[PDB]
């Protein structure tokens, strides 16, 4: 089971992680049943 | 989940994921009914010493 917990926060801080507390609610539970040892972040390019 | 008690209306703002509730003893104190998704409080039936 892949448990994803999420919390969405409106901030206005420029550079770093804001200092505070926010408990993450569970978003989705996925029955994927696969081995995971490595992961990748996906970004988006901007072209002009 | 089995038990005995009186089911009454409640004012506990359950979050969407949240289904039931537990007291210190871990006995269920509130439950969300299937089919209608409403939140029912579970209050033990009156008892005491004679
Ligand atoms: C049946 O249960 C689902 C939740 O599992 C609910 O969304 C749906 O409204 C229920 N249907 C009826 C007719 O109660």
UniProtKB/Swiss-Prot annotation, chain B:
Attaches the virion to the cell membrane by interacting with host receptor, initiating the infection. The major receptor is host ACE2. When S2/S2' has been cleaved, binding to the receptor triggers direct fusion at the cell membrane. When S2/S2' has not been cleaved, binding to the receptor results in internalization of the virus by endocytosis using host TFRC and GRM2 and leading to fusion of the virion membrane with the host endosomal membrane. Alternatively, may use NRP1/NRP2 and integrin as entry receptors. It comes from Severe acute respiratory syndrome coronavirus 2. Binds to host ACE2. RBD also interacts with the N-linked glycan on 'Asn-90' of ACE2. Cleavage of S generates a polybasic C-terminal sequence on S1 that binds to host Neuropilin-1 (NRP1) and Neuropilin-2 (NRP2) receptors. Interacts with host integrin alpha-5/beta-1 (ITGA5:ITGB1) and with ACE2 in complex with integrin alpha-5/beta-1 (ITGA5:ITGB1). May interact via cytoplasmic c-terminus with M protein. May interact (via N-terminus) with host bilirubin and biliverdin, thereby preventing antibody binding to the SARS-CoV-2 spike NTD via an allosteric mechanism. This is Spike protein S1. The gene is S.
């Amino acid at each position: 089971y892949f448990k994803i917990y999420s919390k969405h926060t409106p901030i206005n801080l420029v550079r770093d992680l804001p200092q505070g507390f926010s408990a993450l609610e569970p978003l989705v539970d996925l029955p994927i049943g696969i081995n995971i040892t490595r992961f990748q972040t996906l970004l988006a390019l901007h072209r002009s | 989940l089995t038990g005995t008690g009186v089911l009454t209306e409640s004012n506990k703002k359950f979050l969407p994921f949240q289904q039931f509730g537990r007291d210190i003893a871990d006995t269920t104190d509130a439950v969300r009914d299937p089919q209608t998704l409403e939140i029912l409080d579970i209050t033990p039936c009156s008892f005491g010493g004679v």
